Structures are given as structure tokens and as C-alpha cells.
């Protein structure tokens, strides 16, 4: 019922969001939004999860994230002299103590950063990389150099996001599922998964594979073209499909093998 | 301005005699003012004059001189590391009032070099904006994108994650990369070597455009180079070798919109 | 040095007994010295001996032991954020004179880990150089490029924007990624998993080379893996499936010197 009372406040604040700004918002609303962000940051709540067998989005948590923007002004952020930043979302690690880091059980390799309101699980290694607000990065996952975990993305356990991999954010539309990378997936260097595509568990995605909602996924075995989902245990490489007229071909992803756990 | 170009153009001719230890007060002030003007967007390395994109070579000269006139120095960062360069951050001396007046956001650890212009309502996710670049109003520069030296980025452009816009500081005469108003550039794409993407274009993911990239127009069968016409929808493709043994990467214009 | 390798090889066999709180002074000194020598370029993880690239497994062991011997600790950054890791920056303790003597540039926010060598006349645009890497004279590392663990980058190499050079710290016997002298690697390309790019090669944009990537030689029709021959010009392509329904990504050598 704690979460129920919390959602009630957030949902009403959202409907009445035109009343809210950094100078004007009730203590109840500010406290609710801050608590929602804190719970997302700790992984006690998560923007999407399995409900009754199916990935489901909690729209109210996306609303909380969006309200957290509305309620804060940008301010200068100090960095020891060489430069400054200017934003309204604090670093997840701004107020961490040595004890907080020890308890977290992950590594933050400089200059990696994550925004406040993302969860980083035990045994995660963040190479220099970016984790946006609302993201959930589960245990044992490797986020390699110049990778991005976009807003609200759900990254499973023991996932390997290779160098320069982009996982797209999906804070809006509110109803849309975020990008979901299930447990034990390998995503090869320079690949991209955006626009709510789901990569199911035990999949192996090679280098330079770009998966959005309009990317044709060609199953070599069956000849079927699908969109938006990599089935569990798929091995996926970059390819092309020929134009009927034989003059050119267009980029696609190809499922070249299917394996078990 | 003409007085400024006059001083820079003559300093360029005599640049062999310029160093961090030797340079007239007039030349140092002119170059410094040219950099300040680029930074504020009062001058720009290229602009559209009488309907045609035109380079101001003297402003490239100003940028190159600014390197010649300064030594590298350690740059502090609060302990974890240091840097060592001769070009300051655009934001080195910014006050809270400066950031407020600028009207853009700099999401940590994003940075821009001094002598680049960032317009109001721009959002810099962690990304890099090099010297001489111009990033116009409402543009979103996403995570690990790069706005290269002298690049001209239009209004309401979306540079998606990992997008590289190449620099063209040299050759002096060469147009920089130009992305016109309202363009979408999809994740992990690249536009380099003075390619122009005209307004209202939509470039998908993994599209790599340089001076030698074949641009195949699906409707007409024509191959062109160096320019994406206004309102083009562009995707990654391949063109077949005549002998049928393989195919080579190209960009394909699949639709034209407006 | 030989005495260094003996100490390190033995420490490696006993690595289960080593920790940030348990390790002899001899072992700590030996590992620290190995890291210092890698950092200075006096030692290197792989080198060309008699025309043949050869890995020194003991230097990889030294790098791995260096992790085992140190705890993660918070790393300060002037307020906006903090980091938490056990490998220091190469530049953590650099003086103005150290930077002067090194002869390279570190454009903010570029970073390199302690135990990597950066030669003179190198320019590091914002980029990452991991431990064990060797970046030789005159090389340009462009914005958001990565030089991975143990990578050997030759002289006068241009790693363009967003280029990833993969690391190969393990397996111990495996050659790291090697980019030989005077190579150009175009934007957003990737070289991983011990692929070697031989000298004077030109790799275009969006070329992704790993151990499974087919390298198609246009002139001969031959497919090979793991090696770009000296002077090759390489572009992204595809090879057609026999059944004509699709094609699959490959690299194509379109010209030689």
C-alpha cells in the first residue's frame, strides 16, 4: 500500500503538472517525487518488469522521472577547474560515501557516470559510459567503454554491452516499453538497440547491428521478416536484403543461428 | 570586422614568426577577439550568403593562429586525473548568470571548446563540440556524439547517440560539414569531409557519409556524392559488384518528403 | 627484467593467496615496477621479434596481479560526481614537467590508465586508453576512440572518431589487437579480438573487424580471417547468400598499396 499511496500522489501531480515548477510545488508532491527517484535509484522500484509473464511498464514511474525534471532548475556543476557543467539532474554518485560504494558492489571507472534515479546492481562494471535516469542495470553486467544505457532501459544479469554500444531511452511515450536486454545477452561493439526493441535472453548480437522498430529482422532458416524482437538464444549479424530490381540492397539484421541455454 | 579580418589575414601570412613567446599585442588581441566572436556566434566559419553556403577562410586562420599562440598547460580536475592542452573549455570562466543567459544545458561530462557557439534551447548530453563549431537553437546533441571543428549545425537538429560530425579546419577553402535545419541523424551515423545534409532530411542509423560515399537514389537510379538533398530519407545499403561475388557499402535515398 | 618475471610468474601461481591485505613486499614491489615499466614504454605486452609479433604473458600477469593487489576507492572530481575504481589514472601524479617531457597532448576529458605508454607527438582527443596499451609516436587518437587493454598502436597511426580497438588481457597467450605503423582507421570502425592490421593500411568508416569477420579480397576472391595485409585498402561490404535471399556483412579489400 506504500507504493499504492505513492502512485496516487504522483498520478495526481502529473494531471496537475502545469501547477508545478522549481519555485512552486507542495511539500507532499516534492517528497513523493523524491521518494520515487530514491526507490528507482536503489532498485526497489523499476520502470518496467515482468508482470504475469509479460514485460510491463509502470507509467507512473516515468511520470515521476518527468516531474523530477519539472521540479528542479539547472545549476552550475563544479569539476575542479578545467570545465563546468550545467544541468538539473544530479549524478547518482554525487553524495556517495566510501561506505555507500563498498555496499553497492559495483565499479565506476573514470570518467563513467550515472544519473540519480538509475539502479546499478552488485558486480556491475561501468567502464567510461553513460547510464541515464530510470535505467536498471542488473548484477554482473559489463558496460564497456563509450556505451550508453538510455533512459528507463532494463538490462538483465550478466549482460555484456560492448564498446560503443547504444541502448536507446524511452521515457516518452509514457505507454511505450523501454528497451529491454534480457539476461546473459552479448551485444557486440558499435551495435544499437533503440525504440523499445526487446532482445530476449541468451542472445548473441554481433558488431554493427542496429535494431530499431523499423529494422527488418530476417530469420535465415524460415525466410520470415519480423520487427521489434530478438527471440531468446538468437545469434544476430548485420546483413542486407536485395531490392527486387537487383540494383541495390538495404540494411537488415539476420538471425543466423538459434541456441539453447 | 573587416579590420579584424585585415589583421588576421596579414598575421597568417607571417605566421612563421609567431609563437607563444613572440607575437604582437595587436595580433594577440585580434585573434582573441575572433575567438570570442565565434564563441558568441557573432561570427561563424561558414554561412549561407545569397542562398549559397560560403566559408570565411580568415576565421579558420584565426582558429589555427590561436593554437600557435598558446602553450599546452596542465588542467586540473579535482584529483582523479589531469589534462594537458592549449585550448580552454568554453565553460572555463562561466558564471551562473552566463549559463542562465546562454539558455542551453551542459549535461555532465559534456564539454565544448572555447570558440564554439551553442544556441539557446540546445541540450548537450555528454558529447564533444570542437572549436569553430556552430550549434543553432533547439538542437539536441545526444550521448557520445561529436560536433567536429567548424561544423555548422542548424536549428532543431537531432544528433542521435554516437553520431560523429567530422571536422574540416583544413583545407582552409573547404566547406565544413553542414547539417541544415530540422534534420534527424540516427544513432551511430557519421557525416564527414564537407558533406552537406540539407534541411528536413532523415538519416537512419549506421549511415556513414563522406566525400567518397556513393549516394544511391532508389527512384532515379542515380549515384551522387557529397550532398543529401532537402527532405531525403536515407538508409544504409549496398550496391552489387557487376560480377555478383560481393557488394559494397552505400547510402540509399529511399523516400523524398515535404 | 628476468628477476622481475620470475617473481611475477611465481606470484601468479600463488595468486589465490594474494590480496590488497596479503602480499609480500617483494611481490608488491615487482608488480609495481612492471606497471611503471609498461607506463614508460620500457616494457611492452607484445612486440615484434624477428619479424614476428610475440606476447609476453608475464606482463599480462603483472597487469592482472595489479588488480588483485589493490582495493577500489572513491576518486574525487571537484564535486559534480565521483568514481570508484582500483586503477589510477596515468596522469594522477603528473607535474607540469612530466607533461612537458612526455611530448603528448591530453585533450579534456581524455584519460589513460596507469600502465599504458603514450609516446611523444601523440594527440589524445577525448578518448580512453586502457592499461597495458602502447601508443607510439605521432599517433592521433580522435574523439570517443578507445585503445583497449594491451593494444599495440604503431607510429603515425590515425584512429578516427569513435574507433574502438578491442582489449585482449585474457586469454594470456592471445595476441592483443595490433595496428602497425602508418595505418588509417576510419570513423566508427572497430578492430577487436587480436586482429592485426599491417602497416600502411587504410580502413574506411564502419569497418568492423573481429576474428569471425570475413575479409574478402576482391582481386583474388579469397576469404581470410584475422589479418589485414600490409598496404590494404578496406571498405565495408556484404557477401551474397547462395540462395539469393540476403547477404551478410564482410570487409572487402578493394586495393593494395
TrEMBL record, chain B:
Top class in the EC scheme: transferase
Membership in a protein family: Belongs to the transferase hexapeptide repeat family.
GO cellular component assignments: cytoplasm
Catalytically driven reaction(s): (S)-2,3,4,5-tetrahydrodipicolinate + succinyl-CoA + H2O = (S)-2-succinylamino-6-oxoheptanedioate + CoA
GO annotation terms (biological process): diaminopimelate biosynthetic process; lysine biosynthetic process via diaminopimelate
This protein's record includes keyword DNA-binding: no
Domain (Tetrahydrodipicolinate-N-succinyltransferase chain A): residue spans on this chain: 3-69
Pathway terms, separated by semicolons: Amino-acid biosynthesis; L-lysine biosynthesis via DAP pathway; LL-2,6-diaminopimelate from (S)-tetrahydrodipicolinate (succinylase route): step 1/3
Enzyme Commission designation: 2.3.1.117
Sites where the protein binds substrate: 105, 142
Protein name, as recorded: 2,3,4,5-tetrahydropyridine-2,6-dicarboxylate N-succinyltransferase
Organism listed in the record: Burkholderia pseudomallei (strain 1710b)
GO molecular function, one term: 2,3,4,5-tetrahydropyridine-2,6-dicarboxylate N-succinyltransferase activity
Subunit annotation: Homotrimer.
Subcellular localization(s) per the UniProt record: Cytoplasm
Alphabetical UniProt keywords: Acyltransferase, Amino-acid biosynthesis, Cytoplasm, Diaminopimelate biosynthesis, Lysine biosynthesis, Repeat, Transferase
From TrEMBL, chain C:
Signal peptide, first to last residue: none
Tetrahydrodipicolinate-N-succinyltransferase chain A domain segment(s): 3-69
Residues holding substrate: 105, 142
Pathway(s): Amino-acid biosynthesis; L-lysine biosynthesis via DAP pathway; LL-2,6-diaminopimelate from (S)-tetrahydrodipicolinate (succinylase route): step 1/3
Example GO BP: lysine biosynthetic process via diaminopimelate
Keyword Cytoplasm: yes
Compartmental location: Cytoplasm
Reactions that this protein is recorded to catalyse: (S)-2,3,4,5-tetrahydrodipicolinate + succinyl-CoA + H2O = (S)-2-succinylamino-6-oxoheptanedioate + CoA
Complexes and interactors: Homotrimer.
Similarity comment: family membership: Belongs to the transferase hexapeptide repeat family.
Protein's UniProt name: 2,3,4,5-tetrahydropyridine-2,6-dicarboxylate N-succinyltransferase
Residues of the full protein shown: 39 to 295 of 312
